Amino acid sequence: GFRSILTGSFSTPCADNPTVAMVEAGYHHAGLDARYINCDVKASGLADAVKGAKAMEWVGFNCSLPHKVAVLDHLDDIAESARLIGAVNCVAIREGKLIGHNTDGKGFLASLKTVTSPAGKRVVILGAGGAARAIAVELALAGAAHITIVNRDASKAETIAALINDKTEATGEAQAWSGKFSLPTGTDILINATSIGLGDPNAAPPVEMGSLTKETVVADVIPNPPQTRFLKDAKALGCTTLDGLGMLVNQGVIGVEIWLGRTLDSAVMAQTLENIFG
């Protein structure tokens, strides 16, 4: 049987997106006859690419820049977390119908779940972009007690906190970011969701790191380098840390679970990313 289960990605540009290599290393290890097709899709082409995937009987696809908001017009249904975030980067094709999911905060959550439960937790998020918004939503849905969004543009922080308060069980709070700030002593989870440190081992987010102890799980969305200055400082302060490489891998695992109903191995996929980055 020469038919492979078909998955893929629509984005532009797509050449720097390593998802194909890690997902296919997952497929191979799991002995699944399935493929991940990395497509360069322009904004003008999205509608036809989506229809393509349905006609070619794909079971799902990812969507990256610039298609995350644009894709919503093509959906027949949408997951709660996806809808709250306002963006979709993982579409399932179920019985010819398109269902939108967001995994940008789900990757973080599964990494988080290896070390602690989000339920009842006090969370500080640095950043108020797409990633921060996604992480805040998934945290709140999973039972987090209190989420603080810290951002230079306070109005962006205000938007996320209001979302958290209005639409979830969690308490959301916005904080204007000006200089280093001290963490509340009761902070369980501190997440960098800014672009600080992206391809830059020396740049650290302005937070008072002495207000940070081993009682706080420190996380960073930066995929490469995975060992950011932020995580390296937190580690030396005794904190458990989680990195953006592990998070990115988990987006791939969650995606394939949504598409195929099968759980690929994160360890294998993380080593593929390690290979590519290294």
Q: Residue 247 interacts with ligand NDP (CB under 6 A)?
A: yes
Catalytic residue among 51, 54, 68, 121: 68
Query: What are the angstrom distances between the C-alpha of 185 and each of 199, 215, 216?
Result: 31, 9, 9
Give the single-character DSSP code of 3: P
26 near 253, Cβ under 8 Å? Answer: yes
Strand, coil or helix: what is 179?
coil
Is the bond preceding residue 184 a cis peptide, omega within 30 degrees? Answer: no
Residue 68 known to be catalytic: yes
Backbone φ, ψ for residue 150 (5° rounding): -110, 125
Size of the site for ligand NDP (CB under 6 A): 25
d(CA 58, CA 216): 42
Question: Least Å distance between CB 52 and a second copy?
Answer: 2
Contact pattern for ligand NDP over residues 121 through 160, marking x by CB under 6 A: ------xxxxxx------------------xxx--x----
131 makes contact, choosing from ligand NDP, a second copy, none, with CB < 5 to 8 Å by partner type, with ligand NDP
* Partner from ligand NDP, a second copy, none binding residue 198, C-beta < 5-8 Å depending on class: ligand NDP
Q: Distance between CA 270 and CA 273 in Å, rounded?
A: 5
Sort strands 189-192 and 122-126 into parallel, antiparallel or unpaired: parallel
Q: Please, which residue, 99 or 174, has the CB nearer to ligand NDP?
A: 174
For a second copy, the binding residue among 28, 29, 30, 35 (CB under 8 A) is 35
Which residue from 110, 123, 135, 138 is spatially nearest to 242, judged by alpha carbons? 110
Taking the complex as a whole, the smallest distance from the CB of residue 228 to a second copy amounts, in Å, to 23
List residues near ligand NDP by CB under 6 A: 104, 107, 127-132, 151-153, 156, 177, 193-196, 198, 221-223, 244, 247-248, 251
List residues near a second copy by CB under 8 A: 1-4, 6, 10, 13-21, 35, 37-42, 45-49, 51-57
Catalytic residues: 68
